[PDB]
Design a protein around this ligand. Structure first.
Ligand code: EHC
Length: 136
């Protein structure tokens, strides 16, 4: 197997900045205690690609989570805040677009490479949070 464009995401990343994450979590429906503990976390994200399977691991003092998926193919995901969601992740012009559906609700998480950073934009009903990761 040769290189893939998505290899640009592969590596070990650490959170360096976060904006509006509490408001994003409020819009998602996260309860008070989870919002406070999750908002304190400074996760590391580990992204790897093996064939068609992309794996994203998140490790923090709050929770450790992992998803593996194939682009375009829906999967079950239990989120760090304990939502059971149906997820589909696709690549749109270099951006990983992750849609989560649950309880008649929907949120979109976009992950993109900007300069040497990995920028994560979380969007729910007009509320956006931007989380910036740098190489660990
Ligand atoms: O956090 C990110 O950048 C992030 C990116 C893409 C997608 C989700 C992300 N985070 C969260 C989103 C909603 C609710 C929670 Cl609770 C978290 C979270 C908050 C802290 C935490 C974890 C998850 C796992 C490791 O620690």
């Amino acid at each position: 197997r040769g290189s893939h464009m998505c290899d640009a995401f592969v590596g070990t990343w650490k959170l360096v900045s976060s904006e509006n994450f509490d408001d994003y979590m409020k819009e998602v429906g996260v309860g008070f205690a989870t919002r406070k503990v999750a908002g304190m976390a400074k996760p590391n994200m580990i992204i790897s690609v093996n064939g068609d399977v992309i794996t994203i691991k998140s490790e923090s003092t709050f929770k450790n989570t992992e998803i593996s998926f194939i682009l375009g193919q829906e999967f079950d995901e239990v989120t760090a805040d304990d939502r059971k969601v149906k997820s589909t992740i696709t690549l749109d012009g270099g951006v990983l677009v992750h849609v989560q559906k649950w309880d008649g609700k929907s949120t979109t998480i976009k992950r993109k490479r900007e300069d040497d950073k990995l920028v994560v934009e979380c969007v729910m009903k007009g509320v956006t949070s931007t989380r910036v990761y740098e190489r660990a």
